[PDB]
């Protein structure tokens, strides 16, 4: 029966209470590496957990000789209730977001050394205590004035543990309150980095004071049933909206409902005749009231068309200038709008990132009328938007970008106002832009056309759901699995070669490598170490591992350009156009038969093709179509878009799922061997009689944290795909393929309902390394592919750095992104790893920096002065002075 003595510490073994009680009991367990404590407050059982991994220190230490043995946590634990259901942090006063230590009176016939083997280490300190919205928060006395990021970044250093909010009483003021803020910013990030609870912060900020010599900063906070996490002013890629309101760039924020450790909240947490729990209620009073830091009081905003799957929403700070409310009311106008979820998906339009070109105007706009055509009783606009932007629209946008202005490509996906469509190129475009009205959402007065992606010619790539749900036509194995078989252990070559291996590597981009391609144009190396190939090796290592685990394939002749759509209405109802750019596969060795021109490095496609849409499950989404060489087609510079007919009957785009042209994907692939053999059938409500609120909004909101509907689609086509080789003559997967028209994303006509079939079955692939229970016998070639599976000082510094737990040897592991032997070291969470590597490898990069730059400066490898150093094994096998430059200008101008 040990006892809680929660609070902080303020000297280096005195500790200041905040909390008691009586009655814990304690258990560990090896197994996950859990210890669990077992208090009750007075009318309940409650229960702790805390894992292994969230311990920052463990003392030994010593109180009145029976015990106490301390305990510093860096995430708080999770509580439970009695029937076990989460809570909501029962103390009285909000302790558990304000102590951060978790020292427990251990009274047993043992004291600690019972249990200290399960625990990291222990070191005896015996001393004695000292003294007695949203937590844990730090707030500027009266009397001083310091920058606002000074105020979160000292509320991040004592949510982090490097700080003690005791200690912050006017001294750091008065010490810090006449500097610049950049030597503030370094010595904060010296101290980011030290070990644990700098306890003089006075001498600290001195000492180091002796030595006085596009992308927007973001703050984010991470709201969690307990306390609140700051995260420090770092870099985003700016949205429109934030972007806009430029001064005010402090009273904006990123907020993420996220668990103790920082994961998304499963909807298991948030409702288990189901009844809701603590944390509902929580995160539904924290968005309708609001929270308050130093001088802010931030209040909803809004939510992107991301972020509703991504848990966040931008907050504001309302202040004497500017509201939310003024904002909401500046981005469109929400008052006649029903169904209250397409109000909330509508009104984060403008919330997604992009390079905004060029506010052009409303009168250069033309509308012209849209192509429609009437049939049946239903109409087919023919258009989810399409746009004719002139080819010197797209020559200017290509700069702003950074692209080549002399070949721009044939498309973008505009946003621009109320609507929202890809504007394919047009040569007989008679202004810079002509919109008609099918995709306009809210008679907004927003403009300055953003950009979210452009016609572009991707390397093709796919996996186990391609092959799947696009192979029960026609297309059976060797496709999928020769190219793996092949090029996953033949290529990677360290030693021999690299003439077609860094654009194998690459072809996911080839940003990483430049040695290779640089290894024979300049000298091999001036010494021989063999650590330049076990580098190689590493990222060898890299690639395989990835392609192998996410099983990765490709098909030749294709690419994945966006949807086009004719104009000269010469195709009647079956004809499309491809005009595809080549590579160097393509551009060597060029003779296929498919091909119409190959005029140097563009080749038409003459034979039947098919596309399709992604996230399409209805029978028929692939349409096979008659490719022709339409002569003006080609007069009008097509390349790479997929040209759709605009004359006969029930569009080809809408016969896809429901999709016309708003900027989606069509994978196209002119390969004879992957093309139908023939369409699979092409087959031919909620009102609240008021206008919108904002708490409708927020339950909608907090409604999907727990009804999710992907998964939905997801495993039920699973099953009645894979699992039973039916294509869609069932009437249940054709019924699912129903159902899910209006409940495919859960922003729709509303929340239609999380799982209207019986349920989500509890099974997945036979790769999550918990296969319970398996179906027969294990078909589609997953497994057959998953088968065939200064200097010296520095160093030493590295290697102290890198020799905690850590299993790294002499320098293989200290250097590989990852250990190089894993197992099952990381199949649980596989997040032990990166966090860790990530911080290490920043700082001894900034360290190497520095200690290269701040010195004819860096000599020895700006002009070859400092020769005894490529002797071999002068020190051990790693020889020092390899980074950033490795064959950059020794190997430019000094030899040849």
Request: net charge neutral; with cysteine; hydrophobic share 40%.
């Given at each position: 029966?040990?006892?809680?003595?929660?609070?902080?510490?303020?000297?280096?073994?005195?500790?200041?209470v905040?909390?008691?009680?009586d009655?814990?009991?304690?258990?560990?367990?090896?197994?996950?590496?859990?210890?669990?404590?077992?208090?009750?407050?007075?009318?309940?059982?409650?229960?702790?957990?805390?894992?292994?991994?969230?311990?920052?220190?463990?003392?030994?230490?010593?109180?009145?000789?029976?015990?106490?043995?301390?305990l510093?946590?860096?995430?708080?634990?999770?509580?439970?209730?009695?029937?076990?259901?989460?809570?909501?942090?029962?103390?009285?006063?909000?302790?558990?977001?304000?102590?951060?230590t978790?020292?427990?009176?251990?009274?047993?016939?043992?004291?600690?050394s019972?249990?200290?083997?399960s625990?990291?280490?222990?070191?005896?300190?015996?001393?004695?205590?000292?003294?007695?919205?949203?937590?844990?928060l730090?707030?500027?006395?009266?009397?001083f004035?310091?920058?606002?990021?000074?105020?979160?970044?000292?509320?991040?250093?004592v949510?982090?543990?490097?700080?003690?909010?005791?200690?912050?009483?006017?001294?750091?003021?008065?010490?810090?309150?006449?500097?610049?803020?950049?030597?503030?910013?370094?010595?904060?990030?010296?101290?980011?980095?030290?070990?644990?609870?700098?306890?003089?912060?006075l001498?600290?900020?001195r000492?180091?004071?002796?030595?006085?010599?596009?992308?927007?900063?973001?703050?984010?906070?991470?709201?969690?049933?307990?306390k609140?996490?700051?995260?420090?002013?770092?870099?985003?890629?700016?949205?429109?909206?934030?972007?806009?309101?430029?001064?005010?760039?402090?009273?904006?924020?990123?907020v993420?409902?996220?668990?103790?450790?920082?994961?998304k909240?499963?909807?298991?947490?948030?409702?288990?005749?189901?009844?809701?729990?603590?944390?509902?209620?929580?995160?539904?009073?924290?968005?309708?009231?609001?929270?308050?830091?130093?001088?802010?009081?931030?209040?909803?905003?809004?939510?992107?068309?991301?972020?509703?799957?991504?848990?966040?929403?931008?907050?504001?700070?309302?202040?004497?200038?500017?509201t939310?409310?003024?904002?909401?009311?500046?981005?469109?106008?929400?008052?006649?709008?029903?169904?209250?979820?397409?109000?909330?998906?509508?009104?984060?339009?403008?919330?997604?990132?992009?390079?905004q070109?060029?506010?052009?105007?409303?009168?250069?706009?033309?509308?012209?009328?849209?192509?429609?055509?009437?049939?049946?009783?239903?109409?087919?606009?023919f258009?989810?938007?399409?746009?004719?932007?002139?080819?010197?629209?797209?020559?200017?946008?290509?700069?702003?970008?950074?692209?080549?202005?002399?070949?721009?490509?044939?498309?973008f996906?505009?946003?621009?106002?109320?609507?929202?469509?890809?504007?394919?190129?047009?040569?007989?475009?008679?202004?810079?832009?002509?919109?008609?009205?099918?995709?306009?959402?809210?008679?907004?007065?927003?403009?300055?056309?953003?950009?979210?992606?452009?016609?572009?010619?991707?390397?093709?790539?796919?996996?186990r759901?391609?092959?799947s749900?696009?192979?029960?036509?026609?297309?059976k194995?060797?496709?999928?699995?020769?190219?793996?078989?092949?090029?996953?252990?033949?290529?990677?070559?360290?030693?021999?070669?690299?003439?077609?291996?860094?654009s194998?590597?690459?072809?996911?981009?080839?940003?990483?490598?430049?040695?290779?391609?640089?290894?024979?144009?300049?000298?091999?190396?001036?010494?021989?170490?063999?650590?330049?190939?076990?580098?190689?090796?590493?990222?060898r290592?890299?690639?395989?591992?990835?392609?192998?685990?996410?099983?990765?394939?490709?098909?030749?002749k294709?690419?994945?350009?966006?949807?086009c759509?004719?104009?000269?209405?010469?195709?009647?109802?079956?004809q499309?156009?491809?005009?595809?750019t080549?590579?160097?596969?393509?551009?060597?060795?060029?003779?296929?038969?498919?091909?119409?021109?190959?005029?140097?490095?563009?080749?038409?496609?003459?034979?039947?093709?098919?596309?399709?849409?992604?996230?399409?499950?209805?029978?028929?989404?692939?349409?096979?179509?008659?490719?022709?060489?339409?002569?003006?087609?080609?007069?009008?510079?097509?390349?790479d878009?997929?040209?759709?007919?605009?004359?006969?009957?029930?569009?080809?785009p809408?016969?896809?799922?429901?999709g016309?042209?708003?900027?989606?994907?069509?994978?196209?692939?002119?390969?004879?061997?992957?093309?139908?053999?023939?369409?699979?059938?092409?087959?031919?409500?909620?009102?609240?009689?008021?206008?919108?609120?904002?708490?409708?909004?927020?339950?909608?909101?907090?409604?999907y944290?727990?009804?999710?509907t992907?998964?939905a689609?997801?495993?039920?086509?699973?099953?009645?795909?894979?699992?039973?080789?039916?294509?869609?003559?069932?009437?249940?997967?054709?019924?699912?393929?129903?159902?899910?028209?209006?409940?495919?994303?859960?922003?729709?006509?509303?929340?239609?309902?999380?799982?209207?079939?019986?349920?989500?079955?509890?099974?997945?692939?036979?790769?999550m390394?918990?296969?319970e229970?398996?179906?027969?016998?294990?078909?589609?070639?997953?497994?057959?592919?998953?088968?065939?599976?200064?200097?010296?000082?520095?160093?030493?510094?590295?290697?102290?750095?890198?020799?905690?737990y850590?299993?790294?040897e002499?320098?293989?592991?200290?250097?590989?992104?990852?250990?190089?032997?894993?197992?099952?070291?990381?199949r649980?969470?596989?997040?032990?790893?990166?966090?860790?590597?990530?911080?290490?490898?920043?700082?001894?990069?900034?360290?190497?920096?520095?200690?290269?730059?701040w010195?004819?400066?860096?000599?020895?490898?700006?002009?070859?002065?400092?020769?005894?150093?490529?002797?071999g094994?002068?020190r051990?096998?790693?020889?020092?002075?390899?980074?950033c430059?490795?064959?950059?200008?020794?190997k430019?101008?000094?030899?040849?």
């Amino acid at each position: 029966s040990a006892s809680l003595i929660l609070g902080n510490r303020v000297a280096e073994r005195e500790l200041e209470v905040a909390y008691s009680c009586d009655g814990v009991r304690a258990e560990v367990i090896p197994r996950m590496r859990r210890v669990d404590l077992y208090l009750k407050h007075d009318s309940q059982s409650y229960k702790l957990e805390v894992l292994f991994e969230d311990i920052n220190e463990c003392f030994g230490c010593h109180l009145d000789g029976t015990g106490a043995i301390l305990l510093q946590l860096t995430y708080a634990p999770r509580i439970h209730i009695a029937i076990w259901v989460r809570a909501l942090d029962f103390t009285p006063n909000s302790s558990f977001g304000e102590c951060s230590t978790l020292v427990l009176k251990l009274s047993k016939g043992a004291s600690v050394s019972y249990i200290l083997e399960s625990l990291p280490f222990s070191g005896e300190l015996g001393e004695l205590a000292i003294a007695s919205n949203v937590v844990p928060l730090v707030d500027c006395p009266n009397g001083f004035s310091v920058p606002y990021e000074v105020l979160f970044r000292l509320n991040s250093l004592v949510h982090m543990g490097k700080l003690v909010a005791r200690h912050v009483n006017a001294d750091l003021f008065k010490v810090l309150e006449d500097l610049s803020i950049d030597t503030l910013r370094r010595i904060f990030e010296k101290m980011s980095k030290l070990k644990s609870t700098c306890y003089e912060p006075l001498q600290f900020i001195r000492h180091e004071a002796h030595s006085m010599n596009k992308l927007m900063r973001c703050y984010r906070i991470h709201i969690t049933p307990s306390k609140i996490y700051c995260l420090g002013p770092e870099e985003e890629v700016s949205n429109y909206v934030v972007k806009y309101h430029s001064e005010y760039a402090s009273d904006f924020a990123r907020v993420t409902f996220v668990d103790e450790d920082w994961s998304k909240l499963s909807p298991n947490a948030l409702s288990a005749k189901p009844l809701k729990t603590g944390l509902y209620h929580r995160i539904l009073s924290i968005l309708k009231e609001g929270f308050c830091i130093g001088p802010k009081k931030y209040e909803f905003l809004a939510f992107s068309a991301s972020q509703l799957r991504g848990n966040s929403v931008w907050m504001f700070a309302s202040n004497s200038s500017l509201t939310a409310e003024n904002i909401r009311r500046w981005m469109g106008h929400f008052e006649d709008i029903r169904s209250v979820s397409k109000c909330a998906a509508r009104m984060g339009q403008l919330f997604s990132s992009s390079r905004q070109t060029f506010e052009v105007s409303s009168y250069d706009v033309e509308v012209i009328p849209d192509i429609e055509v009437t049939t049946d009783g239903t109409k087919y606009i023919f258009s989810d938007g399409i746009g004719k932007i002139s080819t010197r629209f797209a020559r200017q946008v290509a700069k702003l970008i950074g692209l080549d202005p002399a070949h721009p490509p044939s498309a973008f996906q505009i946003r621009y106002g109320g609507y929202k469509g890809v504007i394919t190129i047009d040569p007989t475009s008679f202004f810079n832009l002509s919109l008609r009205p099918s995709m306009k959402k809210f008679e907004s007065k927003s403009t300055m056309l953003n950009i979210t992606n452009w016609s572009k010619s991707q390397p093709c790539y796919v996996n186990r759901e391609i092959i799947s749900l696009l192979s029960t036509l026609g297309i059976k194995d060797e496709v999928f699995e020769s190219m793996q078989q092949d090029d996953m252990h033949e290529s990677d070559g360290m030693l021999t070669n690299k003439e077609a291996a860094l654009s194998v590597l690459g072809k996911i981009g080839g940003g990483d490598t430049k040695t290779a391609a640089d290894m024979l144009l300049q000298g091999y190396e001036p010494s021989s170490e063999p650590y330049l190939l076990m580098i190689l090796k590493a990222h060898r290592a890299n690639r395989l591992t990835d392609i192998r685990t996410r099983c990765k394939i490709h098909v030749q002749k294709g690419r994945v350009l966006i949807g086009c759509l004719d104009e000269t209405c010469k195709l009647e109802y079956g004809q499309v156009y491809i005009r595809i750019t080549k590579n160097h596969k393509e551009q060597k060795y060029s003779e296929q038969p498919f091909f119409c021109n190959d005029d140097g490095k563009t080749a038409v496609i003459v034979g039947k093709v098919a596309i399709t849409k992604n996230p399409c499950l209805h029978p028929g989404d692939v349409r096979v179509l008659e490719a022709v060489y339409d002569p003006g087609l080609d007069a009008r510079g097509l390349i790479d878009c997929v040209v759709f007919p605009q004359r006969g009957e029930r569009p080809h785009p809408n016969e896809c799922s429901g999709g016309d042209l708003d900027g989606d994907l069509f994978f196209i692939t002119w390969d004879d061997k992957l093309i139908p053999e023939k369409v699979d059938a092409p087959m031919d409500p909620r009102i609240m009689d008021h206008a919108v609120t904002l708490e409708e909004i927020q339950k909608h909101f907090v409604s999907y944290m727990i009804n999710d509907t992907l998964g939905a689609i997801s495993t039920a086509h699973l099953i009645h795909a894979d699992r039973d080789p039916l294509k869609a003559r069932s009437p249940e997967c054709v019924q699912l393929a129903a159902l899910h028209s209006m409940a495919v994303d859960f922003a729709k006509t509303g929340a239609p309902a999380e799982m209207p079939l019986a349920l989500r079955p509890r099974e997945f692939p036979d790769f999550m390394e918990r296969w319970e229970r398996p179906m027969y016998v294990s078909n589609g070639v997953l497994g057959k592919l998953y088968r065939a599976a200064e200097r010296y000082e520095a160093y030493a510094e590295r290697l102290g750095a890198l020799m905690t737990y850590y299993s790294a040897e002499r320098e293989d592991e200290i250097l590989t992104g990852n250990i190089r032997n894993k197992l099952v070291y990381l199949r649980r969470d596989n997040k032990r790893y990166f966090e860790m590597k990530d911080r290490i490898i920043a700082a001894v990069d900034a360290l190497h920096a520095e200690v290269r730059g701040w010195l004819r400066v860096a000599s020895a490898w700006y002009h070859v002065t400092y020769h005894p150093d490529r002797r071999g094994e002068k020190r051990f096998w790693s020889f020092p002075w390899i980074i950033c430059d490795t064959l950059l200008a020794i190997k430019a101008a000094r030899r040849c």
